[PDB]
Amino acid sequence: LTESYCGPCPKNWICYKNNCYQFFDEEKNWYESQASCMSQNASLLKVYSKEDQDLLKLVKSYHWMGLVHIPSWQWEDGSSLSPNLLTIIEMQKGDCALYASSFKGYIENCSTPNTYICMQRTV
Amino acid sequence: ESYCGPCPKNWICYKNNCYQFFDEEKNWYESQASCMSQNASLLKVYSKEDQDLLKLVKSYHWMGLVHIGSWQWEDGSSLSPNLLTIIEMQKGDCALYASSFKGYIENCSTPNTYICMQRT
Ligand SMILES: Cc1cc([C@H](NC(=O)c2cnccc2-c2ccc(C(F)(F)F)cc2)C(=O)N(C)C)cc(C(F)(F)F)c1
Numbered sequence A: 001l002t003e004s005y006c007g008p009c010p011k012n013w014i015c016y017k018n019n020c021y022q023f024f025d026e027e028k029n030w031y032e033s034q035a036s037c038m039s040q041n042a043s044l045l046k047v048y049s050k051e052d053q054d055l056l057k058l059v060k061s062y063h064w065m066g067l068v069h070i071p072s073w074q075w076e077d078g079s080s081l082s083p084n085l086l087t088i089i090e091m092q093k094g095d096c097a098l099y100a101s102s103f104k105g106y107i108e109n110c111s112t113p114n115t116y117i118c119m120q121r122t123v
Numbered sequence B: 001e002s003y004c005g006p007c008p009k010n011w012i013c014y015k016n017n018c019y020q021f022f023d024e025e026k027n028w029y030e031s032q033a034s035c036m037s038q039n040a041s042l043l044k045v046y047s048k049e050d051q052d053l054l055k056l057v058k059s060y061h062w063m064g065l066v067h068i069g070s071w072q073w074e075d076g077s078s079l080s081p082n083l084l085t086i087i088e089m090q091k092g093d094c095a096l097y098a099s100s101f102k103g104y105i106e107n108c109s110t111p112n113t114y115i116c117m118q119r120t
Helices: A030-039 A054-058 B028-037 B052-056
Strands: A003-009 A014-016 A019-028 A063-069 A073-075 A087-089 A096-100 A104-108 A114-121 B002-008 B012-014 B017-026 B061-067 B071-073 B085-088 B094-098 B102-106 B112-119
Touching: A003 A014, A019 A030, A030 A063, A030 A114, A063 A104, B002 B012, B002 B017, B017 B028, B028 B061, B028 B112, B061 B102
Parallel strands: A063 A114, A087 A104, B061 B112, B085 B102
Antiparallel strands: A003 B002, A014 A019, A014 B012, A019 A114, A063 A073, A063 A096, A096 A104, B012 B017, B017 B112, B061 B071, B061 B094, B094 B102
């Protein structure tokens, strides 16, 4: 119940535990979605902590996140996917993944248009 | 970039308002009491611009709008015009929020999920 601040974030972004999130409903393929986040000084959603990002339990439908398959799964920044964070489930043949609740990743062709989530970290 | 809040750690912050969703279904009175136990109130809608995140809310949830006059919030203030479209769903004196900027008239005794809000 103790009060603190959250951010810094741009005003039009949701802030939660010092990460900034923005939802985009205009459907784009994975690459176009990544480019859109980058144009906003951001990246596609990166899942690094179930506790610090527990708001993702409330995220419904299916959205691009920054997770890609190198033919291991890894993020845009080049870091690998930590274990016990996401359950990765096959769906459509492809090398990208859609976030869905709760902490699931559905494999999807990178060229399929989807909604997407951008995230900015503050540290 | 700026800071948002203040808010408690487990709440979403948007434009200096704090929001928390509660999945346990409760009637309007129990929901109000739950928010009060967290130094908060049920959702109050005052601005489509400051609260445009409410366009993204899925399903329907108790907010702090009641019929005693007009519809009014817990804090005694009146519902501002041109904020919510009010729709009759159940015989009731309470209202659920639904996107986008709708209020469903609902029996206060019906269990529903709810949204608490804190400001400053
Ligand atoms: C993380 C986030 C997810 C959603 C939106 N899900 C929902 O609304 C949702 C779905 N099932 C249950 C509850 C909720 C919910 C209820 C109240 C709020 C609150 F914020 F009022 F507390 C937030 C979520 C979703 O999944 N999409 C946007 C794709 C919306 C928001 C927010 F409204 F904040 F922007 C945040």
